[PDB]
Amino acid sequence: SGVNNTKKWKMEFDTRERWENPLMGWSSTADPLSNLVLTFSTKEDAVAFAEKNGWSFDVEERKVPKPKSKSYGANFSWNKRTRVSTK
Amino acid sequence: GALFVHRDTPENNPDTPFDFTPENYKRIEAIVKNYPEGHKAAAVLPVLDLAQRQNGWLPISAMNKVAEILQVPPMRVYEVATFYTMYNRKPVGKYHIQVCTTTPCMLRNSDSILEAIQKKLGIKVGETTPDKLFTLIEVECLGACVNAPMVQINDNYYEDLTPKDIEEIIDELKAGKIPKPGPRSGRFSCEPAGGLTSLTEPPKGPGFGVQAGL
Amino acid sequence: PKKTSFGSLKDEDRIFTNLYGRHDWRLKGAQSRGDWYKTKEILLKGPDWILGEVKTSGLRGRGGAGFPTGLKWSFMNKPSDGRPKYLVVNADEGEPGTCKDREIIRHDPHKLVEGCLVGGRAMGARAAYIYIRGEFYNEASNLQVAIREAYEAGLIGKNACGSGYDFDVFVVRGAGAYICGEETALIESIEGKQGKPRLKPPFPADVGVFGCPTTVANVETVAVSPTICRRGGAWFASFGRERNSGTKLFNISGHVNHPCTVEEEMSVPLKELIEKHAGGVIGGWDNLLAVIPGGSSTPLIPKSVCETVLMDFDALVQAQTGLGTAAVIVMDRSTDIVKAIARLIEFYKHESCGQCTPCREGVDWMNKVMARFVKGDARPAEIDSLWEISKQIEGHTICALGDGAAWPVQGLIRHFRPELEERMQQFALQHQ
Amino acid sequence: EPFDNSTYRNLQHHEYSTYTFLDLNVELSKFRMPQPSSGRQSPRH
Amino acid sequence: SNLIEVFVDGQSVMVEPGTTVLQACEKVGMQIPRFCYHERLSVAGNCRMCLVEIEKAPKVVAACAMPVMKGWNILTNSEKSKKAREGVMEFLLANHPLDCPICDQGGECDLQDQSMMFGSDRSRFLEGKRAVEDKNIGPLVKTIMTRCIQCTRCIRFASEIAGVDDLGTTGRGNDMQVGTYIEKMFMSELSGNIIDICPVGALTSKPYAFTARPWETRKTESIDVMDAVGSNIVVSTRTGEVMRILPRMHEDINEEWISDKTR
Numbered sequence A: 001s002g003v004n005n006t007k008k009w010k011m012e013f014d015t016r017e018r019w020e021n022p023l024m025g026w027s028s029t030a031d032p033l034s035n036l037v038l039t040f041s042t043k044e045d046a047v048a049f050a051e052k053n054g055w056s057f058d059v060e061e062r063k064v065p066k067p068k069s070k071s072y073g074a075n076f077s078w079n080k081r082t083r084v085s086t087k
Numbered sequence B: 001g002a003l004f005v006h007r008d009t010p011e012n013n014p015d016t017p018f019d020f021t022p023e024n025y026k027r028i029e030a031i032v033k034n035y036p037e038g039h040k041a042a043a044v045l046p047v048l049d050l051a052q053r054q055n056g057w058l059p060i061s062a063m064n065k066v067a068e069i070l071q072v073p074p075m076r077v078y079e080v081a082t083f084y085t086m087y088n089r090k091p092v093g094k095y096h097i098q099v100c101t102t103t104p105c106m107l108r109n110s111d112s113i114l115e116a117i118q119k120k121l122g123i124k125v126g127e128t129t130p131d132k133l134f135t136l137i138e139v140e141c142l143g144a145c146v147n148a149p150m151v152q153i154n155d156n157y158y159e160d161l162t163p164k165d166i167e168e169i170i171d172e173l174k175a176g177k178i179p180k181p182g183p184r185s186g187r188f189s190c191e192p193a194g195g196l197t198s199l200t201e202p203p204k205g206p207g208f209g210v211q212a213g214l
Numbered sequence C: 001p002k003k004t005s006f007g008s009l010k011d012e013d014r015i016f017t018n019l020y021g022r023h024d025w026r027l028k029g030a031q032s033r034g035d036w037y038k039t040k041e042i043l044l045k046g047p048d049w050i051l052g053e054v055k056t057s058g059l060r061g062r063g064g065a066g067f068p069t070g071l072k073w074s075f076m077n078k079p080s081d082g083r084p085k086y087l088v089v090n091a092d093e094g095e096p097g098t099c100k101d102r103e104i105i106r107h108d109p110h111k112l113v114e115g116c117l118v119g120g121r122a123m124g125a126r127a128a129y130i131y132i133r134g135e136f137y138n139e140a141s142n143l144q145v146a147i148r149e150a151y152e153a154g155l156i157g158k159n160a161c162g163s164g165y166d167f168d169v170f171v172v173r174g175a176g177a178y179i180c181g182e183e184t185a186l187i188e189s190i191e192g193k194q195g196k197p198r199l200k201p202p203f204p205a206d207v208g209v210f211g212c213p214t215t216v217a218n219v220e221t222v223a224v225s226p227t228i229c230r231r232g233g234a235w236f237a238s239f240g241r242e243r244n245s246g247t248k249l250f251n252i253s254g255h256v257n258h259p260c261t262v263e264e265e266m267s268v269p270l271k272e273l274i275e276k277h278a279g280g281v282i283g284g285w286d287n288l289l290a291v292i293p294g295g296s297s298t299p300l301i302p303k304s305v306c307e308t309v310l311m312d313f314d315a316l317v318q319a320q321t322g323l324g325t326a327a328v329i330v331m332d333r334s335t336d337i338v339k340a341i342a343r344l345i346e347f348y349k350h351e352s353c354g355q356c357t358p359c360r361e362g363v364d365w366m367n368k369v370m371a372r373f374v375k376g377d378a379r380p381a382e383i384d385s386l387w388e389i390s391k392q393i394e395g396h397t398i399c400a401l402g403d404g405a406a407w408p409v410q411g412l413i414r415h416f417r418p419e420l421e422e423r424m425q426q427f428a429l430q431h432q
Numbered sequence D: 001e002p003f004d005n006s007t008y009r010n011l012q013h014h015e016y017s018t019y020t021f022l023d024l025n026v027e028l029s030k031f032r033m034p035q036p037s038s039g040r041q042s043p044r045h
Numbered sequence E: 001s002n003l004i005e006v007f008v009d010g011q012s013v014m015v016e017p018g019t020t021v022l023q024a025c026e027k028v029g030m031q032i033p034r035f036c037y038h039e040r041l042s043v044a045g046n047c048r049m050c051l052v053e054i055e056k057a058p059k060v061v062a063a064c065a066m067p068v069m070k071g072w073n074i075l076t077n078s079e080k081s082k083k084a085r086e087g088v089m090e091f092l093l094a095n096h097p098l099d100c101p102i103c104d105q106g107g108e109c110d111l112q113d114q115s116m117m118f119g120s121d122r123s124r125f126l127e128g129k130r131a132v133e134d135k136n137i138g139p140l141v142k143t144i145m146t147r148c149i150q151c152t153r154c155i156r157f158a159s160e161i162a163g164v165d166d167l168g169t170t171g172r173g174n175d176m177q178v179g180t181y182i183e184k185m186f187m188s189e190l191s192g193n194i195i196d197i198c199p200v201g202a203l204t205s206k207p208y209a210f211t212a213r214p215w216e217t218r219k220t221e222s223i224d225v226m227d228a229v230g231s232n233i234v235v236s237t238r239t240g241e242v243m244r245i246l247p248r249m250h251e252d253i254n255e256e257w258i259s260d261k262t263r
C-alpha cells in the first residue's frame, strides 16, 4: 500500500532475448542497454533527455488518483444499501 | 477447548437434523416482528438463543438453518454464535454451570466455591459430568457482585453462596430436586446484615413536585 | 444556598425508592409510588422542558461516562428526519461491581420504561430498544410485565401515557458480553452484529442503531427521569454539590461486612459513607488494603488515601481515580493486590473483542506480564515497562475499554509500587 | 395492604418457565405499533 | 463554494466537506501510515496505525474514519503522533510470528517497510506468542493465519467487492480469527485478488509461493488477454520467465483488481 515510488518517470528499454547458459544455467544476455533504468522528475525533462540524444520513443500519462468519497457514517444506514455486515 | 473452528464433527455437522417447532416458528416470527424491515438480520441473536434452548446446546445445523430463514449469509450468524459468550457451539450438559470467579466476587472467597464444586463433582472445570448434568466453566460475574459469591446453574444463578452452601444446593440438583435461585439467605437480593439502610421507611406516594401544569 | 451537609440521604430521596422490591416492585405499586402520575402532561409540556428538568437536576454520566444528562438529551431534539429515531438504554451491567442496576430492573423497572417515554419525547422519536443483558433474563421478564401493562393502558406505545404521542420500547435480551455495555458496541447487538464498538461520527444524534438517531443512555438516565422530572430536578439537585449533585446507587461490595445496594446522596466524603453503608469495612478500615469506589475501569486507591477523599466525579479524579458507576468494591490486607488485578485483567482479556489492535493484543500483554508479577518473575524495571505499556494502550483504542483497562492497573503503578516491588523481589530472593 | 420490608415480592427471580421472554413477546405482538418501512427488504435487497 | 480550508501541519489547503483526514494528508503528499484502509474499500479504523494528533485536542484523533473540520493542523511529525504510531506498530508486530525469511511477503510487506520508517529498533516483548490454525481454502491462495494482523481488509474486499459471503472474524479478542469457521473453498472469479490487498503474508499465492522475491523481479506492465476487458497487468520476469501477475491500477478497465483466470 505504500506510495512513495510512483513519483518519478524513468527511462527503460525493450527487452531482448535471454538464452539459458549451456553451463549451470545463468540467463546470458547480450543487451547492454537493458539494465539502464534512469530517473526523471517530470515527463518534460524525460522527453528532453530522449530528444537530446534522439531516440525512438513513446509517451505515457501519469496515473492520477480519483476522489475516494469516503464516509464512515455511510457504512451504517437505514434506507441506504451501503451498510456493511462485518467490519 | 475453545476452538472456534468446525472440525466437521460426525454428528453436529450439516447432516444434523434441525426443526423449529411450529410453536417456536410463530415465536421466532414475533422476534422478527420486533425489529424494523430492511434490517431483519437483527434476529440472529435471539433466534440463535431459541435454537439453543430448543435443543439444549446450539447445533451447527441450526446455524445453517437460521441463516436462510432470517435471509442472512451463514458466516454472519456464525459470527454471532462464535462471539456472544455462552452460545454453546458444542454439546452442553443439562446444568450449564457458570462459576463467577471475577475479582469482586473472587475477593469474597468464591475460590473455595470453585474448587469444592469442582472436587465434589470430580470432573475438572470444563467437560460435563458423565451423567451430562453439570458442566462447570469459570466465568465472570452474572451481575451480582453486590451479592456474596455467585454461580450460574443451568439457566438459573444462585446468590449469597457459602463454601458449604454451594455444594448443598447443587447436590440437591444432582438428586433431582431444584432449589430456588437467588440469594441463599434471608437476603432477598443484597440487604445489609446489620440492618436495612435502604427501604426502611414507606416509599413516597403520588402527588409530589407539582410544577403548575406538571 | 449551600449544602455542606453532604450525606445521610433517605429512601424518599433515592431515585429507586423501591430498589429492594419490598412493596409491589412492578408498576402496580409504582403508580402508588409517585411515577406514572402526571407523566404524559410533562411529556407534552415540552421536549426542551424534559431536558430542562434533567439539566436543572444535573445528573452527569453515572454509568461511567461523566456526561451531563442535559447535554446528551439536548443533542437529540432535532426534528424528525424521516429515519425513525429511537432510544437505547444500556443495561449490560457486566462490569465487575456493576450490579446496582441489576437490582432495580427486578425492583424498579417501571421508571426504566417511564423514563424512556418522557425522555423519548425530547427527540420526537417513536420507539426504543432497551438492551437488558442475557444473564438478566429474569430482569427482562420483569420489564416485560412492566411494559405489557404500559402498552395496555397506553403508557408505552401509541398515546404515550395518554397524550396521543406514539412512543414504545421493545425489550430484547443480551448474551452476556460485557463489551456490549460500550455505548458503541451496543449498536451492533441491537441490529444483529458482533459487538465491536463503532466510531463517532456518526454520533447517537446522527446515524446509530439501524442507521438512525438513537440515544444510548445508561440505566440511570431513563430510571431517574420520572423522578427528576415530575418530582423535580431541583429536588434532586438540592442534594449534592455543583454539577455532581443528588443521589446515586452505591454498590458497596467486595470483601466487606454487609455488601448492599444503597442510593445514598452523592458528592459526599467517602470515609463515613462506606463506614456506615455496610456497617464499615469488614475488619475495619485499618485491616483494609484498598477500596475501589468506581469499580473495574477505575484506579484502585490505597487505604490511606481512601480515608481522605470525596466520592464525586470531580473529587475522585482529583485523587486520579474514577467513580464511574459507584461500584464500591472493598478489598483488605489479607488478599494481595497483584492477585486482585490478576482477576481484573483476566476479565478484560475475556471481554475484549479484538477489533482495534491496541486492546486486542494489548490486554493480552498486560495479563501475561502481570502473570509474572503475581508469581514474581519480573524486575523493578518491568514495572516501569508495564506502566509504559499501559500508556500506549491509553487513548489509542477505538473505545474506552482499552482506556478502561489502563485506569485500574495504572493506579496500581502509582499507588502500590512498593507492594509490587516486594512481590517480584521475594520470588527471586528465596529462589536462590 | 401497606409496605412491608421483609418480603421478596419478586419471586419471579426464583420461579419462571423455559421460554419466558418470547411467550410474553408473542403477547407483546398485540400492540407492537407498526415499524417504519425501509423500502428495501435488506441491505442486499 | 463549500470547500473548507485546512492548515495541515502549517500549509493551508481547501478540501470538500466530509473528507477524511487521510485524503487531506495525501493531498499535500503526506502518505500517512495505514494498514486496514484501502482507497476503493470501506473504512475500518481498526489498525490504529493512522492515529495522528490534531491541534488543540487532548486526544489523538483516529484520522482513518474522522472527517476534517473547519481549520485543523495535522501534527504529522509531532512526538505525540509518532508516539501513537510507535505504540500501535510494535503492538501489531508483537504477536507476529518470526517467519520473515519464510513468509513470501518479504520485500513486499507493509508490516516490514513501515517498521523501517515508522518503527522501533528493538523489542520489549518477553512473554510467549499466539499461533493460529492455518485455514485451508483454495488450491490457489495459501493462508498462514498466524501472520494475520486482523486488519479485516480481506472480509471487506470480499463482501463489498466480490459480493460473496466467504470469510469471517470468528473468535473474540486475541483469539478472534479471520476465516470461514466451517471449512469451505472460497471460489470467486476474482478470488486471486485478496493476495494483494493483504498487507502481510497471511494470504499468499500458492503457485508463485516460494519461487521468486521482489528485488529479483523486474516488473513489466501489459494488459490481460484472457478476457475482453483487457485488464492492465504487471508481469514479474525474474531471469527469463514469468512468475506472477499484478493488477496494474488504471481505474476504468480493471482498477487494481484482476480475476483468477488472468493472474
Ligand SMILES: Cc1cc2nc3c(=O)[nH]c(=O)nc-3n(C[C@H](O)[C@H](O)[C@H](O)COP(=O)(O)O)c2cc1C
Binding pocket: C060, C061, C062, C063, C064, C065, C066, C067, C072, C089, C090, C091, C092, C093, C094, C095, C098, C178, C179, C180, C181, C182, C183, C184, C216, C217, C218, C219, C220, C221, C297, C399, C400, C401, C404
Ligand atoms: C468499557 C465500557 C463498558 C461499559 N459497560 C457498560 C455496561 O455494561 N452497562 C451499561 O449500562 N453501560 C456501560 N458502559 C457505559 C456506556 O458506554 C454509556 O456510557 C451508556 O450507554 C450511557 O451512560 P450515561 O447514561 O451515564 O451517559 C460502558 C462503558 C465503557 C467505556
Ligand code: SF4
Binding pocket: C179, C196, C197, C351, C352, C353, C354, C355, C356, C357, C358, C359, C360, C397, C398, C399, C400, C401, C402
Ligand atoms: S479497545 Fe478492545 S473492545 Fe474496544 S474496539 Fe478495540 S479491541 Fe474492541
Ligand code: SF4
Binding pocket: E096, E097, E098, E099, E100, E101, E103, E104, E105, E106, E107, E109, E110, E111, E112, E147, E199, E200, E201, E202
Ligand atoms: S508478513 Fe510477517 S513474516 Fe511475512 S515478511 Fe511481513 S513481517 Fe515478515
Ligand code: SF4
Binding pocket: E147, E148, E149, E150, E151, E152, E153, E154, E155, E178, E197, E198, E199, E200, E202, E203
Ligand atoms: S488475512 Fe490478511 S487481509 Fe485478512 S484480516 Fe488478516 S492480514 Fe488482513
Ligand code: FES
Binding pocket: B100, B101, B102, B103, B104, B105, B106, B140, B141, B142, B143, B144, B145, B146, B148, B149, B150, C096, C097
Ligand atoms: S462478582 Fe460475583 S457476580 Fe459479578
Ligand code: FES
Binding pocket: E033, E034, E035, E036, E037, E044, E045, E046, E047, E048, E049, E050, E063, E064, E065
Ligand atoms: S489503517 Fe486507519 S486504522 Fe487501520
Ligand SMILES: [K+]
Binding pocket: E105, E194, E195, E196, E197, E198, E199, E200, E201, E202, E203, E204
Ligand atoms: K499479501
